[PDB]
Design a protein around this ligand. Sequence first.
Ligand SMILES: O=C(NO)c1ccc(C(=O)NO)o1
Ligand code: NA
Ligand code: NA
Ligand SMILES: [Zn+2]
Ligand SMILES: [Zn+2]
Ligand SMILES: [Zn+2]
Ligand SMILES: [Zn+2]
Ligand SMILES: [Zn+2]
Ligand SMILES: [Zn+2]
Ligand SMILES: [Zn+2]
Ligand SMILES: [Zn+2]
Ligand SMILES: [Zn+2]
Ligand SMILES: [Zn+2]
Ligand SMILES: [Zn+2]
Ligand SMILES: [Zn+2]
Ligand SMILES: [Zn+2]
Ligand SMILES: [Zn+2]
Ligand SMILES: [Zn+2]
Ligand SMILES: [Zn+2]
Ligand SMILES: [Zn+2]
Lengths: 174, 174, 174, 174, 174, 174
Amino acid sequence: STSQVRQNYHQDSEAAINRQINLELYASYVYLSMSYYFDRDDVALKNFAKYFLHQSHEEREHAEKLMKLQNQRGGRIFLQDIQKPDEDDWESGLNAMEAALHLEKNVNQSLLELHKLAHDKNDPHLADFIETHYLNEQVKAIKELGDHVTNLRKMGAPESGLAEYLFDKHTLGD
Amino acid sequence: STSQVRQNYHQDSEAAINRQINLELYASYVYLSMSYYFDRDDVALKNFAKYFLHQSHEEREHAEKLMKLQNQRGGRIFLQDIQKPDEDDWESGLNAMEAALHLEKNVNQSLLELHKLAHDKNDPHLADFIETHYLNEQVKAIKELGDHVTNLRKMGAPESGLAEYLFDKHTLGD
Amino acid sequence: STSQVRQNYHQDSEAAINRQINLELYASYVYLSMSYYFDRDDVALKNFAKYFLHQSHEEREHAEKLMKLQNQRGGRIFLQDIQKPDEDDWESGLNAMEAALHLEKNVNQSLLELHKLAHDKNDPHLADFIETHYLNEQVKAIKELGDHVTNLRKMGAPESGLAEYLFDKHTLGD
Amino acid sequence: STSQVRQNYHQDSEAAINRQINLELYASYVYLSMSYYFDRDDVALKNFAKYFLHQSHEEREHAEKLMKLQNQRGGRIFLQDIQKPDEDDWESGLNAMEAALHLEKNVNQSLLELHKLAHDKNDPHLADFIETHYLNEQVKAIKELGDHVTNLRKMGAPESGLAEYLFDKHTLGD
Amino acid sequence: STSQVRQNYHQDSEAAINRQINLELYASYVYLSMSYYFDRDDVALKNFAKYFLHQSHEEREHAEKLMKLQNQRGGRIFLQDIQKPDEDDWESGLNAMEAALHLEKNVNQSLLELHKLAHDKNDPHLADFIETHYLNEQVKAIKELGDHVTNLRKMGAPESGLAEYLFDKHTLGD
Amino acid sequence: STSQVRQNYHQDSEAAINRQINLELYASYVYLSMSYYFDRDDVALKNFAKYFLHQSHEEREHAEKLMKLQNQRGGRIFLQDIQKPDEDDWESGLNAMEAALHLEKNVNQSLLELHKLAHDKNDPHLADFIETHYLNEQVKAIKELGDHVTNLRKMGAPESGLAEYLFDKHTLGD
Ligand SMILES: O=C(NO)c1ccc(C(=O)NO)o1
Ligand code: NA
Ligand code: NA
Ligand SMILES: [Zn+2]
Ligand SMILES: [Zn+2]
Ligand SMILES: [Zn+2]
Ligand SMILES: [Zn+2]
Ligand SMILES: [Zn+2]
Ligand SMILES: [Zn+2]
Ligand SMILES: [Zn+2]
Ligand SMILES: [Zn+2]
Ligand SMILES: [Zn+2]
Ligand SMILES: [Zn+2]
Ligand SMILES: [Zn+2]
Ligand SMILES: [Zn+2]
Ligand SMILES: [Zn+2]
Ligand SMILES: [Zn+2]
Ligand SMILES: [Zn+2]
Ligand SMILES: [Zn+2]
Ligand SMILES: [Zn+2]
């Protein structure tokens, strides 16, 4: 069918959207994994644990937002498997942060491509949606992972464990 | 003359804005008419009446801030007569819901054509204007009207006058 | 047909009422034009603009009120084209006020004939309706415009731009 | 490495918990899809949608509390892919209710086998865990889903389009 | 070294951003000069004075938000000397308002050029940055300075001492 | 011309004030530069940044009060180019503190010489103005910079990344 509400809504755009949803749920899955990793009795950095748990809940917010744009435009949601992440053990506070930064650069890439598509297919509505709710969020996050990584490294992580423990106290703990 | 504030504002943009002004005022007249049709002693659905008197007042807001925009950029407002609606009797609640859907998807086509003009003339201010204050509002508008229609249909409207009475109570009365 | 509520309601009154509705929308439209005219970067008298905009929203109430009385008496609303105002460029504050006084004297005329018709068709309900909700409002609005004209002319307008700028500050801006 | 906190926690229990974690995440995914299904403009039952969006967030909670449990006991979390749901179109609100029921009765069955496992490994902490935080919860949840289905049926669902609309109003909307 | 956070950030964009910073710091300097001009014992227009000083601090905000952006995107800040303003003596309130109009149109074109660049390099994050934090802020400033220049002109300035005094009180003084 | 307020205000003092104005504008630029350096994703010390950004704005205040003073005494302001800081990269937090220190003694130096000028020209208003608003402010700034440098060196700056991270937390974040 074609929904009564659909208008200037191209099907690459619609299919690009069902792709992002999955990517956002993917990242939500990664951050859950990082979170409970730093909750391990042998790692025990509670603020690393809550930092990523919060990112896990936000990625969820991202996907649900897109699931809403879809129906709003008259596209139809098709869901897919969520890949388990690439690790079971994230090694270190620094390394987990670097993986986070890598993950978000990559989600950012897809958002930019999704913007290009929306622009190329002359969807001003879809494109302002990406710029308003996603683009600058991803710059902020990526700037923030960058800063953390810079600070964990300058402090002598992940060699110095003292380093990671003070960072969990003094940066991720308000 | 050429206004002292004019900058990057193409006379084709100026004349498109004036067109949109008239179309918004037109919208408002349609809803005004729909509203006072449901206030007739033989239609007597008050929440339908309120729901359109509101959109009537909303569309008037839409025109008024196009008028501001026009002067903001140093163009010049020319008003044209306001066409009376297509109908005097709007038949039923479902139907008026189907009519407004049609109307808003139409006004939305105009906004997407105003915006593409803006893009092509390299007017980012005007394109952003359209994006923030109109596109998204139209997609929320289109999406809602669709929802009401689907519900009226599934309830058994327009035949069932029970359904329309109940939809007025449980859906448009808060 | 004939509405189950109609009573001592003559169809000339009904057609007289549809006419006034249009006329009120007309004035509503004239006052909008005046308003955004003084919002022009090359006119720029904010309080002239806010004054006429407020008159715009009141005429809209003036007309919705009449559309209410129509359905109330079981008459039936037929709308009509809203003719664009007789100017796009209202020249000055003095001249805008003078046009406005002309406009309302003319609308006052139409109401008085409507009262005459209501009286002549022995409709004391329609007659009290015009006495209560319109007649003294039209005397107040005519007197107010006259005083503004008197003051703007006594301040040496419209050749003294100083004149009109002080009037906008000291009379229309509280 | 064997965790410094592990005590009377059998590696069969550990692997049984990780299994439940995945099942709970999976249910969360099912409710998610059920939810934004009723957000489509052709379904348009907003309280069905709210009701399922909530259970999705609850099933998430279910998983998170299991991941805390694993680490509390000295086990090690291993996530796995999240299987997308069986349907992309859940047909009707009655049906989704019937599917949800089936789903919940399925997860209840897994926790009773986890419970029997715990008991047989003489793991009373893990049995008391399942007793307090899951068993009565699923039992309340199964009973409510039975109630809603029984009611949707008794009102004439899913054929009576009015029925589902009203259940969404009168039962799922407070 | 490429900054760790960089992504879709063009070296033209970065250098153009560095130019806009200088241009904003140059704006703030001009408005500073204008403000203490009116503070002179032989000009003595405190509201002109306070008007431009507020505008001076605004421009400094415009620059600092550009700088933060450079860092967010991984760009690199390079400052250059701040050109002293063109005049030491700004003649009068009218001429000062005119010169601000010229200044802000010049800033506005540089920013439209910066947006164009951003679009030419497929940097939607940058373009929507310029869109939402600068473009309509420049239109507002340009409209307001338009109105001010107009109202000063119609009053009789710069020939009428009275006019620049009363505009100081009744417009620049709230 | 000679100003109508001018009294016991020497041309050299008028000259030395104008130059002092420029030097405070310079100090504000330096501090602004140091601030956004510490905002870089590869330096990432938020409280060094806040510290220097607060300096930056205070120095602006220093200059505006000189501009105010100049007009009070009947002198005439002449603004010069504001030269860009010596550095684009400030290396480290300790080296930035040390360069702040060097700058503030240089500013102290010129302020003391401006005081000697005022004494020499028997200008006690000018002398007390300098004493009252700048002299102890300069001593306080230099004492605080001295202490910071001292602490940063004892902690092992600049070699110690940890030292600069802990100083940012425990001294500059309150
Ligand atoms: O044979 C049994 N069930 O069929 C059995 C043996 C021991 C238990 C028990 O309850 N342990 O706590 O149950
Ligand atoms: Na935009
Ligand atoms: Na009477
Ligand atoms: Zn995301
Ligand atoms: Zn993210
Ligand atoms: Zn500490
Ligand atoms: Zn509209
Ligand atoms: Zn609309
Ligand atoms: Zn384009
Ligand atoms: Zn009911
Ligand atoms: Zn009227
Ligand atoms: Zn009137
Ligand atoms: Zn006055
Ligand atoms: Zn569960
Ligand atoms: Zn459940
Ligand atoms: Zn600016
Ligand atoms: Zn500006
Ligand atoms: Zn200073
Ligand atoms: Zn200083
Ligand atoms: Zn002495």
